[PDB]
From Swiss-Prot, chains A, D:
Tissue distribution: Red blood cells.
Subunit structure: Heterotetramer of two alpha chains and two beta chains.
This protein's UniProt keywords: Acetylation, Heme, Iron, Metal-binding, Oxygen transport, Phosphoprotein, Transport
Binding annotation for heme b: 87
Residues that bear N6-succinyllysine: 7, 11, 16, 40
Protein name: Hemoglobin subunit alpha
Known outcome of mutating residue 60 to Q: In fast chain
Modified residues (Phosphoserine): 3, 49, 102, 124, 131, 138
Sites of N6-acetyllysine modification: 16
Residues carrying Phosphotyrosine: 24
From Swiss-Prot, chains B, C:
Assembly description: Heterotetramer of two alpha chains and two beta chains.
PROSITE patterns associated with the record: GLOBIN (PS01033)
Keywords associated with the record: Acetylation, Heme, Iron, Metal-binding, Oxygen transport, Phosphoprotein, S-nitrosylation, Transport
Signal peptide interval: none
Gene name linked to the record: HBB
Protein name, entry field: Hemoglobin subunit beta
Provenance organism: Equus caballus
Residue numbers bearing the S-nitrosocysteine modification: 93
Gene Ontology terms, MF aspect: heme binding; hemoglobin alpha binding; metal ion binding; oxygen binding; oxygen carrier activity
Domain of life: Eukaryota
N-acetylvaline sites (modified residues): 1
Domain spans labelled Globin: 2-146
Length: 141, 146, 146, 141
């Protein structure tokens, strides 16, 4: 996955996202919690109410994490090694959930950058997210 | 499937503001581009070599409108879906042989396309409601697979 | 599900030979090992850190037997899967919130276990019949998701 | 992603398959065609009757392809490059079908190697098949 052309699209497209990564991560999460209830399970200690300071804060974590990955497409297994241990070994998140977040994330991007969300960029951004999901759900150790 | 009384309201409301001329064709096209293997069922449509040809193809908009049409019939007959899509079911199952999982993927791109079209009016609540409708339609077309 | 009269006879005849304890204990154990994220639902069972601790755990064997007995109810009521699993469908969907994909995984794991215990008697024809029964159980359990 | 323990498990279990990879491939295919009829669609030109010499021949190709993959666990993308282009670009095989073939391969292996097909082995062989399926469905790098 992730060919020369996809990388160019990913790097370019994240560029259009800029510093709203944090805000988009928060919106994506809210869309996931409301759209796919089964995912509320992993956050028993959170305030899942509209406008939560925990959700918004967490969304920020997800945002930088994705920005980090976009800068290490040649070695995702390495740059994300820690998050992988957290999600697959410690938290044991079900892989299906990653597709849901990915969907909610793309849906968030379609909302805010309708003119940059072309079919081609859509296709590249989908593969990028799958690859990140495989690494975080991987247990390569 | 089931939605709140106030849910059908916000849902059907949005559906009236939909361009049946476009949405249908952009959903199918994005499906053909993001998940290329689906192109295997649409060879007779002609050129699908690149995103430019697909979104431009005449048969994709035409067929797209038919698809977006039977989706509306879904938005209305929500509490009797198994019946409405019963015929299309034995069609995609017996003739075409389309895997159930693909109905889910088209439903999700349809959602993303709606998102690109209505922007912020397409709120997480509204999106949540549509995930229900999308899920039911998909399940109905799969009934004949047992 | 509805299988040919001959198939039923074949499926039911194999089940007379199934030891619910041995088979169930191994099926649930393999699920926990091959798909580690399923472990989250059984943290109360104790140490599941390694395959040796999982296969040896007494609660895994005990719950395994209960699960296999449930499949047996399905195999003897192939005409009424929906009604047979209605209660378990509420438990797994509404109460526990288990993703439906896992039901299929457990169904296939079960098939692999049967294949290992019956070897050459588990012919590709008998398996094909069992993929139907297993597929049948999965959908009935996912019935509350629709 | 395959770990070290997984690579060792795979290379060891396949040592057990030995020279029966071809036979197991044919049985796997026979189990798949009867277990999931839809897959026949992809073989309109084949004689899918029982004991078909056409299925045995193909089963052999698949068996060899897998023995080749086991020899290049460290670089599956490179060693299976041509198969990917054939399955993704020309054939356009729905990815779902790969899970069906993998389940039939595992089933076939459980039948013939009951004493060696332990939980641990089962687990690694599954990561291996998912990993091979990823490569063959990707229009990658
Ligand atoms: C795009 C994929 C995802 C990325 C990039 C991501 C990233 C992160 C990061 C950076 C952290 C650590 C933050 C910290 O140190 O406090 C984290 C924690 C966590 N993630 Fe994810 N995550 C993703 C998907 C998931 C999914 C799908 C779930 C489940 C629905 C999930 C559940 C959690 C939980 C429960 C925590 C710990 C929350 C806490 O206690 O603060 N993550 N994630
Ligand atoms: C939400 C699910 C879907 C809906 C509501 C839908 C709806 C339709 C409708 C209304 C028709 C036209 C039948 C007629 O006019 O008699 C049709 C035909 C067809 N559909 Fe679907 N469909 C869906 C998903 C799929 C998927 C995922 C595939 C792609 C693999 C697919 C492949 C086809 C094909 C190849 C035809 C034949 C078109 C022709 O040659 O005229 N459909 N579908
Ligand atoms: C083939 C599908 C399955 C069948 C037939 C099945 C059957 C059952 C049955 C009969 C019970 C025992 C109920 C009782 O003792 O009153 C049970 C409980 C439960 N099931 Fe399942 N189950 C299936 C799949 C799953 C999956 C995949 C998960 C895990 C992800 C799961 C998680 C649970 C949990 C957490 C309980 C409560 C355990 C306890 O405290 O006894 N089940 N299931
Ligand atoms: C474990 C993954 C799989 C492997 C290792 C595999 C391997 C191969 C190999 C080695 C060939 C090469 C033929 C040659 O050049 O001599 C081939 C051809 C082919 N494969 Fe696969 N394959 C796999 C899964 C699938 C699946 C899931 C399908 C679809 C159900 C599929 C459909 C085909 C078809 C139709 C051909 C062409 C056969 C012909 O017309 O001669 N393959 N595959």
């Amino acid at each position: 996955v992730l060919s020369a052309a996809d990388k160019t699209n990913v790097k370019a497209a994240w560029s259009k996202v800029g510093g709203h990564a944090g805000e988009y991560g928060a919106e994506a999460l809210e869309r996931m919690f409301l759209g796919f209830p089964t995912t509320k399970t992993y956050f028993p200690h959170f305030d899942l109410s509209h406008g939560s300071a925990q959700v918004k804060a967490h969304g920020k974590k997800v945002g930088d994490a994705l920005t980090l990955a976009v800068g290490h497409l040649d070695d995702l297994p390495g740059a994300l090694s820690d998050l992988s241990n957290l999600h697959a070994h410690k938290l044991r998140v079900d892989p299906v959930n990653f597709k849901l977040l990915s969907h909610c994330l793309l849906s968030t991007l379609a909302v805010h950058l309708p003119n940059d969300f072309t079919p081609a960029v859509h296709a590249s951004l989908d593969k990028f997210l799958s690859s990140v999901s495989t690494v975080l759900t991987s247990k390569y150790r | 499937v089931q939605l709140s009384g106030e849910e059908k309201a916000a849902v059907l409301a949005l559906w009236d503001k939909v361009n049946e001329e476009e949405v249908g064709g952009e959903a199918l096209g994005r499906l053909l581009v993001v998940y290329p293997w689906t192109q295997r069922f649409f060879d007779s449509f002609g050129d699908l070599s690149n995103p430019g040809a697909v979104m431009g193809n005449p048969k994709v908009k035409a067929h797209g409108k038919k698809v977006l049409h039977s989706f509306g019939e879904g938005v209305h007959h929500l509490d009797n879906l198994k019946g409405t899509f019963a015929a299309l079911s034995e069609l995609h199952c017996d003739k075409l042989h389309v895997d159930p999982e693909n109905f889910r993927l088209l439903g999700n791109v349809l959602v993303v396309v709606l998102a690109r079209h209505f922007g912020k009016d397409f709120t997480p609540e509204l999106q949540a409601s549509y995930q229900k409708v999308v899920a039911g339609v998909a399940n109905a077309l799969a009934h004949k697979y047992h």
